[PDB]
């Protein structure tokens, strides 16, 4: 707030400031533009999924353990333990200055993240290109192995070792 910051309660100061012109219009316009830009960035980043997908109750995906990345209802906010650690490790009107809140709350961002996770683990890469085709996760892994130039048998013959290594990597 130009008045509060520059002058405060001084009416003669406000009268003197009115002589300078339209500096404060530009200032407020730029600040509101920055705010809308941050909001648009958050939206474009976290709202890429079309619909909020769900996860099956049976949390079994052929030995792959996603408990460290999937949301945990055992706490108030539906956030994974990794997300909880990330949030805990990051620490977070005064004479004119104010801080407006974001449009998407932390809970909504977490819901978008959970939807993206469910889609990725339940329908492969298809949910990002059309209807979310339900596909088994070992077959998704075979698809991606073929994608990196490795045949599917290389997976299907080591599935157990691969899943164990993946769990250890998440840990």
């Amino acid at each position: 707030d130009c008045t509060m910051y520059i002058c405060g309660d001084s009416t003669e100061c406000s009268n003197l400031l009115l002589q300078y012109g339209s500096f404060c219009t530009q200032l407020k316009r730029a600040l509101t533009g920055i705010a809308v830009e941050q909001d648009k960035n958050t939206q474009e980043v976290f709202a890429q999924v079309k619909q909020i997908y769900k996860t099956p109750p049976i949390k079994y995906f052929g030995g792959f353990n996603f408990s460290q990345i999937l949301p945990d209802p055992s706490k108030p906010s539906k956030r994974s333990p990794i997300e909880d650690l990330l949030f805990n490790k990051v620490t977070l009107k005064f004479n004119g200055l104010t801080v407006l809140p974001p449009l998407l709350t932390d809970e909504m961002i977490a819901q978008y993240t959970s939807a993206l996770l469910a889609g990725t683990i339940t329908s492969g890469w298809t949910f990002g290109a059309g209807p979310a085709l339900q596909i088994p996760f070992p077959m998704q892994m075979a698809y991606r192995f073929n994608g990196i130039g490795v045949t599917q048998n290389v997976l299907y013959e080591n599935q157990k070792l691969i899943a164990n290594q993946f769990n250890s990597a998440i840990g």
Partner: protein, 114 residues
């Protein structure tokens, strides 16, 4: 206690109704009065039906013209879609569709000199 006031408006094209948002103010110290994390909202009723965000207020709340009055609501991220997962079943597309998406990008400004 002080804070900026914003005017929620559906546009003079539609109606002259307006709702005022006192940013960060707790209206316990200054027809429907509704308190939100972004401030206090006067002139808009809180509807419990979730809709797409028309006018963003803040903290997950938006406003829009009901059609009749200005309603405030918690924005919906999207419709729930449960995927039937199974380690022995698949979904395969028996069809396809060709679509044409329109995209726009600016490339240049107005060359100016003073």
């Amino acid at each position: 206690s002080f804070g900026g006031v914003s005017v929620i408006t559906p546009g003079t094209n539609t109606s002259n109704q307006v709702a005022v948002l006192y940013q960060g103010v707790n209206c316990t110290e200054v027809s429907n009065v509704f308190q939100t994390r972004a401030g206090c909202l006067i002139g808009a009723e809180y509807v419990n039906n979730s809709y797409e965000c028309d006018i963003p207020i803040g903290a997950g709340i938006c406003a829009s013209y009901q059609t009749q009055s200005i309603i405030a609501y918690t924005m919906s991220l999207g419709a729930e879609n449960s995927v039937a997962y199974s380690n022995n079943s698949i979904a395969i597309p028996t069809n396809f569709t060709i679509s044409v998406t329109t995209e726009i990008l600016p490339v240049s400004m107005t060359k100016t000199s003073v």
